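As noted in the main text, all predictions were made from sequence alone. Below is one such record, for ATP synthase epsilon chain.
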Amino acid sequence: IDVLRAKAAKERAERRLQSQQDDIDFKRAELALKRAMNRLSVAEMK
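Prediction:
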């Protein structure tokens, strides 16, 4: 709901994605982004 939180997470996940050693992170960060994005869409045209 709070765009502030959604943004903070998007920025945190984006930075983590850069990590190469965390090969087992892109997967989780991928599902999280997809979820956060979906919520954002509904928010606008709520």
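The two ends are 11 Å apart (CA to CA). The chain has two helices and no strands. These features were considered when defining construct boundaries for the mutagenesis experiments described in Section 2.9.
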